């Protein structure tokens, strides 16, 4: 198996920092939106629903920011030591719980609430831009894939760590028989197993750059849509 390296504690902190920026970006844009729905009496209860979601994201965030990785990682001599997949298991577990929570929040916010706003307000002052919705999905799909990568590469995969959207894509493709295995769907693309932490750290940095890119683009669309709710 793979044993931990001295830089394991930092690697964990970096990965969690990714999720923290993910959560904070939502908390920032939703607190603006929640504060604006206060003047719209017809959306009084949809406002409280979003508040419940934000509090969950807040808790998810200040739990990530409070977690000290070096506290739950025993190094010793390069043993006796903690296996590397032991320290990653609760990290990927955290990502899964947050990702599925996002899946819930994303649907309500980008589908249900959108249709309810148009029905109640009869205009599009307080709706999300089509640009932002794509940023929501694009960011979600990659945090999903990254979560799957941490799990499958270390072979810590089970039914308890499965993400729904990945499992949906698998069975939907298993039914329609799609196909030769080209494949365009990222959820259907297989994960190569990691043979060393030196390889896990490298590939994590590659994801870290990509996920920050999507997160950066997500921040951009939130700024634009927060402008539309100017007054």
């Amino acid at each position: 198996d793979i044993k931990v390296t001295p830089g394991t504690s930092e690697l964990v902190e970096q990965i969690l920092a990714l999720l923290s920026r993910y959560l904070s970006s939502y908390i920032h844009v939703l607190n603006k939106f929640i504060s604006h729905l206060r003047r719209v009496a017809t959306l009084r209860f949809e406002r409280t629903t979003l508040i419940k979601f934000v509090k969950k994201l807040r808790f998810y965030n200040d739990s990530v920011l409070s977690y000290n990785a070096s506290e739950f990682i025993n190094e010793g001599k390069n043993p006796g030591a903690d296996s590397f997949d032991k320290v990653i298991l609760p990290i990927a577990s955290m990502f899964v719980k947050c990702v599925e929570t996002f899946d819930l929040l994303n649907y309500y916010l980008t589908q249900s609430l959108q249709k309810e706003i148009l029905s109640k307000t009869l205009n599009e002052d307080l709706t999300l831009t089509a640009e932002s919705i794509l940023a929501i999905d694009d960011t979600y799909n990659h945090f999903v894939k990254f979560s799957q990568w941490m799990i499958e590469s270390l072979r810590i995969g089970s039914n308890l760590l499965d993400l729904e959207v990945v499992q949906f894509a698998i069975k939907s493709a298993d039914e329609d028989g799609t196909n030769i295995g080209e494949t365009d769907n990222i959820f259907l693309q297989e994960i190569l197993p990691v043979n060393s932490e030196e390889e896990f750290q490298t590939l994590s940095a590659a994801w870290h750059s990509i996920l920050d890119g999507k997160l950066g683009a997500l921040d951009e669309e939130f700024d634009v849509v927060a402008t539309k709710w100017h007054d």
Binding site: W149, T183, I186, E190, L203, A206, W207, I210
Partner: peptide
């Protein structure tokens, strides 16, 4: 779309 550690 080239994701690392992922066989496209």
């Amino acid at each position: 779309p080239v994701l690392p550690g992922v066989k496209r």
